[PDB]
Design a protein around this ligand. Structure first.
Ligand SMILES: [Ca+2]
Lengths: 223, 58
């Protein structure tokens, strides 16, 4: 997260870190056995770390659980990034508490202008690199589809939504993918892609979760 | 050596943090960089051995 702030400790209880040796992506806990992330975050072996604030220090609130099932959306395109969503079933149900909690799926699609919270342990710099120990937060609005389309000519599908600022300065970055975009208590977006980080005229592009509620529910029920 | 070996490491548009290797022509050896997870260019390898075999010249 570039241009954000350090989240209050455990104030984003649904945020998880996907780890395969090192932190490589984020995710959101939707029920005690399932996490939703980005399809490009796929790896054959994934360990989900919940209740994290400082990913480099054993604090005492963490829960480490391995992924038992990893299911990418059947229509995910690795080049266009359309349908960039993935579900992870945990090997065992996590213990829900104030620091490890679920986030609700969208009741319907949120309109442009809706203010949201984006979070993650990704790079905090637009130029160069700084991997933060502490979870970063960013308050940003869903942008009008026309502005998203203008920023990324011919690259935006109905399954994508731009969140951020046309003037740049604040954005999600490498290490944030798969993470949450929560608006009014609902997971409306998943960190997906963008050209650079926090660059003017190139706000981050996110998977539009409201288009996948049925797929998510059907997949969970069948697995 | 191949042309792609002389290009700077390409993170790409995706936002994951995937550690990959690239040939650093100035340094004369393969080093690590952060790959975003999609649309990789050719100077991107999953191992130092594969990187040096391909871009080592000689
Ligand atoms: Ca920790």
């Amino acid at each position: 997260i570039v241009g954000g702030y350090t989240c209050q400790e455990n104030s984003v209880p649904y945020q998880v870190s996907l780890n395969s040796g090192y932190h490589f992506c984020g995710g959101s806990l939707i029920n005690d056995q399932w996490v939703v992330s980005a399809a490009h975050c796929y790896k054959s072996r994934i360990q989900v770390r919940l209740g994290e604030h400082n990913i480099n220090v054993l604090e005492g609130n963490e829960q480490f659980v391995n992924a038992a099932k990893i299911i990418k959306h059947p229509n995910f395109d690795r080049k266009t990034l359309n349908n960039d969503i993935m579900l992870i079933k945990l090997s065992s149900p996590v213990k829900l508490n104030a620091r490890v909690a679920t986030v609700a799926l969208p009741s319907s699609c949120a309109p442009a202008g809706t203010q949201c919270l984006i979070s993650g342990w990704g790079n905090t710099l637009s130029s160069g690199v700084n991997e933060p120990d502490l979870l970063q937060c960013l308050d940003a609005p869903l942008l009008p589809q026309a502005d998203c389309e203008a920023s990324y000519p011919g690259k935006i599908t109905d399954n994508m939504v731009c969140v951020g600022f046309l003037e740049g300065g604040k954005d999600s970055c490498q290490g944030d993918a798969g993470g949450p975009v929560v608006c009014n208590g609902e997971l409306q977006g998943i960190v997906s892609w963008g050209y650079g980080c926090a660059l003017p005229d190139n706000p981050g592009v996110y998977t539009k979760v409201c288009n996948y509620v049925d797929w998510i529910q059907d997949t969970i029920a069948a697995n | 050596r191949p042309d792609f070996c002389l290009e700077p490491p390409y993170t790409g548009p995706c936002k994951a943090r995937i550690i990959r290797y690239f040939y650093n022509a100035k340094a004369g050896l393969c080093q690590t960089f952060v790959y975003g997870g999609c649309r990789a260019k050719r100077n991107n390898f999953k191992s130092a051995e594969d990187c040096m075999r391909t871009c080592g010249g000689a």
